[PDB]
Amino acid sequence: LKITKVEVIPISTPMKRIDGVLLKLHSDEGLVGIADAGDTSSWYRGETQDSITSMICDFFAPKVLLGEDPTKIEKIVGRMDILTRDNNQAKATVDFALHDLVGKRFGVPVYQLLGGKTIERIPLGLVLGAGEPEAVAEEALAVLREGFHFVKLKAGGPLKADIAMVAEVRRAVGDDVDLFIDINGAWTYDQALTTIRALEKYNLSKIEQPLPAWDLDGMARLRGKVATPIYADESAQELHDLLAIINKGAADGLMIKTQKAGGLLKAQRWLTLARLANLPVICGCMVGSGLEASPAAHLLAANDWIAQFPQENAGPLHIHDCLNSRDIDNDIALNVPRFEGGYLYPNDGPGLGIELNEDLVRRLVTPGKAARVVT
């Protein structure tokens, strides 16, 4: 009923390291809302363990959270946006914890707070790791054999390397497989035009964010010079970005991340615009534990618009480098959401439905750092 303690724990996870943060919102009635920010990326989000910890502990905690009723999510989300510019991941982390606390308080899974369980399970697609073309092709076949619905490749370059990678993978998987690449906005306009055209013979279902996030005119110009659908990820962050994207005709589809959107509530608003745009939405993740994947799992199962498309919320599979969750027993979440046969099933327990492995969390606290508590 009242938040009385805000605790931020800096953790580092090895994968085969991921620097993230865990948040605990203690209430005056025993219940504790928890959340995992997921990995931190200087280029994709621009937030770090320390920026997230300071913004939550030095600002959100004393100015918005302490003494507040956690059920007032619209209110808190609004106050955080007024108080702070950007810091989407920090805000998202708090939002996740609030929903967890509220769900625990009302005795219901978070998807019940997000509109109900629209679908029982979420079909998933997966991104492959870097490697030699022959190796990436082998990993692709393994992903498909497991049941995944699409294969996504990262395009580091040079051109010769990207072409070789795509050609080998397409050769192995066949022409019926949904195969696309992600550029992370690394190309100049000319690079994009040249490379996308050189790849046309491989029939990729789409090209994800080929140009910089801010180059909306470029994305629109590109779409008028190439056949391959162009999806926006980094470009589609805020509500006004989405408006600009539809107005400039800068995309054929969209990617979302709960941390990019700024939280579950902000994600719902984000999805309202995607719906208005009548565009497909694929949700990814900020590589993290079973707790990091939970907010999205609940959202992807509840949101009617996003419930229409295959997803990419598979942080745990990336950290534990495997294709399903039965092959995972040392995650900070004792009960990692179920990943099976290419599908994600959201947990059904109260709140986010995650029980933390407290001893592992203690063992994974970032060397040289410590948890911070605010009351």
Site for a copy of itself in 327-346 (CB under 8 A): none
Angle, helices 239-248 vs 264-277, to 10°: value is 10
Residue with Cβ nearer a copy of itself (60 or 339)? 60
Task: Give 93's contacts (C-beta < 8 A, 6+ positions apart).
Answer: 21, 23, 35, 36, 37, 52, 56, 259
Q: Is 107 in the site for a copy of itself (CB under 8 A)?
A: yes
Peptide bond into 158 cis (omega under 30): yes
Partner from a copy of itself, Ba ion, none contacting 106, C-beta within 5 to 8 A by type: a copy of itself
Distance in Å, CB of 260 to Ba ion, minimum: 10
Interface residue with Ba ion, options 168, 215, 233, 241 (CB under 5 A): 233
Distance in Å, CB of 316 to a copy of itself, minimum: 25
Q: Is 202 in the site for a copy of itself (CB under 8 A)?
A: no
Q: Which residue is nearest to Ba ion (CB)?
A: 233
Site string for a copy of itself, 225-264 (x = CB under 8 A): x-x-x--------xxx--x--xx-x--xx-----------
Pairing of strands 126-127, 151-154: parallel
Rounded CA-CA distance 34/323 in Å is 26
Rounded CA-CA distance 68/182 in Å is 41
- b/e 315-353 (16+ beta carbons within 10 angstroms → b): bbbbbbeebbbeebeebbbebbbbbeebbbebbebbbbb
Rounded CA-CA distance 324/310 in Å is 16
Site string for a copy of itself, 277-306 (x = CB under 8 A): xxxx---------------------xxx--
Residue with Cβ nearer Ba ion (46 or 341)? 46
Q: Is 161 in the site for a copy of itself (CB under 8 A)?
A: no
Q: Is 110 in the site for a copy of itself (CB under 8 A)?
A: no
Q: Give kind and range of the element (H or E) at residue 289.
A: none
Chain contacts with Ba ion (rule: CB under 5 A): 182, 184, 233
